[PDB]
């Protein structure tokens, strides 16, 4: 079960949900995986006309991705995530056995 | 470095309310200032903490103009 988003507070609340749900269901769960942040950037020039001092600005989009693993029913986990999820976050699922 | 009027008047407003718990010690005065104040960021919180310490070190060596 991995998540991806653009706003860190969204992933923070989503993660805070899944640890507490896992502790409530008392099932074996891996610890919160804090992946390195991947940042997307582009530089462009202001002044649409060719006159004036050349001025450029850069942008930054760091994308938050974290991993987790659980031994639980694929149906109950997707139901709880859908209950406690927001459209901004995108989540994928993978299960373990031991 | 100098200081700005906003945090200057912030440091003037307190002390007048609970100088009793405020002492000479910079560390405990700083611990007090976040307890008493409502500044939302750490930098100016500890800035005004140092400023109140700076006013205390001139307290009780003559008139202090206020408080």
């Amino acid at each position: 079960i991995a998540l991806t988003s653009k706003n860190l507070r969204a992933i923070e609340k989503v993660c805070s949900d899944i640890m507490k749900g896992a502790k409530e269901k008392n099932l074996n769960v891996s610890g919160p995986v804090r992946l390195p942040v991947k940042t997307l950037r582009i530089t462009t020039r202001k002044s649409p006309c060719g006159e004036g001092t050349n001025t450029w600005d850069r942008f930054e989009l760091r994308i938050y991705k974290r991993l987790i693993d659980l031994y639980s029913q694929c149906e109950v986990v997707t139901q709880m995530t859908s209950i406690n999820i927001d459209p901004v976050v995108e989540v994928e699922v993978i299960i373990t056995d031991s | 470095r100098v200081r700005t009027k906003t945090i200057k008047r912030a440091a003037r407003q307190i002390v007048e309310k609970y100088y009793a718990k405020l002492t000479l010690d910079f560390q405990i005065n700083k611990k007090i200032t976040e307890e008493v104040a409502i500044i939302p960021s750490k930098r100016m919180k500890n800035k005004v903490a140092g400023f109140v310490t700076h006013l205390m070190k001139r307290i009780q060596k003559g008139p202090v103009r206020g408080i």
Partner: protein, 157 residues
């Protein structure tokens, strides 16, 4: 099966379409949320796929395209804004202005923070171009939401 970066930019592009769709169609009322009237909207979207500062700016635009005196009614819009509860507001209109000389007047009041990241977060700013017999008029409206609390606000009881 596309890369996550391309998925992110694609959804950003789709919401870039969505917000300008909102700007185009949401003219008979303010903003009452977005859907992830309604029948035609959802049909068009699916077929193509497979206090409110923005509303106040639109109201000031509709003002002038009715052909109303600007000076008499901008003050009324200002009263409406401070009755809605803004700390302050600023309306700037640029263009011909009933003459062949380009002018501009700013209507400042209240706090009206103008620079800084806190200004970016708190100030809701909108701009709009309105056609006119001999050109267009640019209207920019900025309104700061009432203050979490601003860093400059210091108070102790």
């Amino acid at each position: 099966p596309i890369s996550k970066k391309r998925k992110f930019i694609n959804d950003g592009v789709f919401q870039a379409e969505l917000n300008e769709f909102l700007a185009r169609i949401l003219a008979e009322d303010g903003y009452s949320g977005v859907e992830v009237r309604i029948r035609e909207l959802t049909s068009l979207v699916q077929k193509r796929f497979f206090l409110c500062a923005m509303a106040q700016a639109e109201s000031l635009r509709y003002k002038l395209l009715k052909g109303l005196a600007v000076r008499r009614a901008c003050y009324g819009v200002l009263r409406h804004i401070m009755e809605s509860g803004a700390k302050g507001c600023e309306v700037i209109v640029s263009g011909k202005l009933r003459a062949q000389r380009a002018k501009s007047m700013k209507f400042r009041d209240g706090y009206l923070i103008s620079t800084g990241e806190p200004s970016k977060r708190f100030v809701n700013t909108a701009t709009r171009s309105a056609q006119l017999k001999q050109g267009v008029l640019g209207i920019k409206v900025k309104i700061m939401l009432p203050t979490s609390i601003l860093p400059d606000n210091i108070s102790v009881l």
